[PDB]
Design a protein around this ligand. Structure first.
Ligand SMILES: [Zn+2]
Length: 192
């Protein structure tokens, strides 16, 4: 298990593909789920924060900070665990599986659900991730020599509302956006 660098093409494909797989398969269906693409600037941001090896959120995701020239606010998911166990698939799946504690009807979360909601946040269409090797991670004293994985999201989600608008798939995309695997695509947005 070697931890990939932020420009590793397989790492990039995994992060994007697996985010989109969960976003495509949501239940209830989403009417407005945007297709998610890689953003190298978001990946650099994740890399810088991840190198701090702290189990807490980047402090500069919101005004008056602005880490990314094109987003007012950024979103963030963090996964921290052992090196052997780490993979893009397991980390993101771990975030998504918080759905078990989420009741879509009422938005009631029984535990921790904010990673799941950011994974499937309709309006978020750019992602960038990084993993760091961390001898110790602050806030997580139990852990030794772990993998510390952070994705940043543009624009940020986790407003006090449903992560997407439930409805017939792709029935409420922006403009005249086409649909690909239950996601709203758009040549302009999706350019990397
Ligand atoms: Zn969190």
């Amino acid at each position: 298990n070697i931890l990939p660098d932020i420009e590793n093409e397989d790492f990039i494909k995994d992060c994007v593909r697996i985010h989109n797989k969960f976003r495509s398969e949501v239940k209830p269906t989403a009417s407005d789920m945007l297709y998610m693409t890689w953003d190298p600037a978001l990946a650099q941001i994740a890399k810088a924060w991840a190198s701090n090896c702290q189990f807490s959120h980047n402090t500069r995701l919101k005004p008056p900070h602005k880490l990314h020239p094109n987003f007012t606010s950024l979103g963030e998911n963090i996964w921290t665990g052992s090196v052997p166990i780490f993979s893009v698939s397991s980390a993101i799946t771990n975030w998504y599986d918080e759905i078990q504690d989420y009741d879509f009807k009422t938005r009631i979360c029984k535990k921790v659900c904010g990673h799941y909601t950011q994974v499937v946040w309709a309006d978020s269409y750019k992602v960038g991730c990084a993993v760091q090797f961390c001898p110790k991670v602050s806030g997580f004293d139990a852990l030794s020599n772990g993998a510390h994985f952070i994705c940043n999201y543009g624009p940020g989600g986790n407003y006090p509302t449903w992560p997407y608008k439930r409805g017939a798939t792709c029935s409420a995309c922006p403009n005249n956006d086409k649909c690909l695997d239950n996601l709203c695509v758009n040549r302009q947005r999706d350019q990397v």
